[PDB]
Ligand binder design. Structure first.
Ligand SMILES: Nc1ncnc2c1ncn2[C@@H]1O[C@H](CSCC[C@H](N)C(=O)O)[C@@H](O)[C@H]1O
Ligand SMILES: Nc1ncnc2c1ncn2[C@@H]1O[C@H](CSCC[C@H](N)C(=O)O)[C@@H](O)[C@H]1O
Lengths: 211, 211
């Protein structure tokens, strides 16, 4: 478990200027894809960052890391926390309106399997929202380097491009993307961000919604 | 040999609009860092793209790939082509005024030995000029992915950041940088480039000169 020792300070970076900007843009992008619904299931809910911020009345978080889970259920108590793996969700078919996978496929053991589970558990016409750190962004460059440099959890991550998702789930009903500036950007961040777009940067976060 | 079948189409990309822009930008940065001198040695001279374009009256190209070499000795006949590895230069010490390593370190066997050899064959007061595809740039993200997907020669490449070079050679005497736009930039390219710089992007090409 690469997250075994990262749980406690996992959100520390969001407090910094750049991190605050990144997390703000990502949430905004995510909100743009979130559909109406009653029940939500986040696979790899980690510290429950999204669980506590999403509005759905019925929220369920699946997290295999004991460390992450310890923090998550503390921070997002209103949700039901289940200790399981994406590859085998302990729920009957067609039980959720929305299933969220935010930068989790980068760490699962079997991507196709996790996606199958997500769709089974998803009810008719259910919305599957997937978010990944676009492999082609300068952020991926940083994380790939940090990974080989032995930094956790990056050393055990796999990187995906929107192309890979579309390859697996087909054409998304809707898309979203955020953070075009680079890791070493200087503020005012909005300038850096618009600049990164114009420079042709792939975004740091790609979001797709499939039914 | 990763370049075993890339020699012929190697320079092809330089024909496209972005390619044209990129390579021209690299040439400008490289020439701006090249010092005064009579003799030049390029380790991993490949297809002689740089040998065919540098002022030095006496220049030698070291290239282990026979495939690349076949093209190089042809496109840059005014230079002496030697078939050897950077790990073992067939030259006595203090014999060159300038030694050039342009995107070669990412393919050699032993980086430290290559650099030791480069320094050995350098005359007193000589200058070593290294150019690498900065590992933190969006281009690095693209090649690491291509390498992952098999694509040669990227599957065999290692990537360096200017910090890696500083750790190996110490603080350079001078530096150069080029191409802040991303692989997917859109024309007008000069704007895209200025954008990438403001975005916080790391240059696709980092150049350093040591003595
Ligand atoms: N095989 C698997 N199945 C389900 N979750 C997994 C998994 N492998 C890793 N994870 C979890 O995926 C999470 C990735 S970190 C992202 C956490 C959360 N989605 C957020 O964006 O805030 C980690 O908490 C990790 O424990
Ligand atoms: N151990 C080694 N010693 C010297 N050269 C090597 C090497 N391993 C690979 N190379 C050469 O390094 C080159 C990298 S491609 C760059 C070629 C040229 N410098 C240019 O920028 O146009 C390849 O042609 C490859 O054959």
């Amino acid at each position: 478990d690469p997250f075994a020792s990262l749980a406690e300070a996992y959100e520390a970076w969001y407090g910094t200027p750049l991190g605050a900007y990144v997390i703000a843009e990502e949430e905004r992008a995510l909100k743009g894809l979130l559909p109406p619904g009653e029940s939500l299931l986040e696979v790899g809910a980690g510290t429950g960052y999204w669980l506590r911020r999403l509005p759905y009345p019925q929220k369920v978080g699946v997290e295999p890391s004991e460390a992450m889970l310890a923090v998550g259920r503390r921070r997002a108590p209103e949700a039901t926390w289940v200790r399981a793996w994406g590859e085998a969700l302990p729920f009957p078919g067609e039980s959720f309106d929305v299933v969220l996978l935010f930068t989790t496929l980068e760490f699962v053991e079997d991507v196709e399997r996790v996606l199958l589970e997500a769709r089974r558990v998803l009810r008719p016409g259910g919305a599957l929202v997937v978010g990944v750190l676009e492999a082609l962004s300068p952020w991926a460059a940083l994380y790939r380097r940090l990974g080989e440099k032995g930094v956790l959890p990056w050393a055990q991550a796999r990187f995906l491009a929107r192309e890979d998702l579309k390859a697996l789930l087909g054409p998304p009903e809707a898309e979203g993307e955020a953070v075009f500036l680079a890791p070493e950007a200087h503020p005012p961040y909005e300038e850096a961000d618009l600049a990164g777009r114009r420079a042709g940067n792939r975004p740091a976060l790609y979001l797709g919604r499939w039914r």
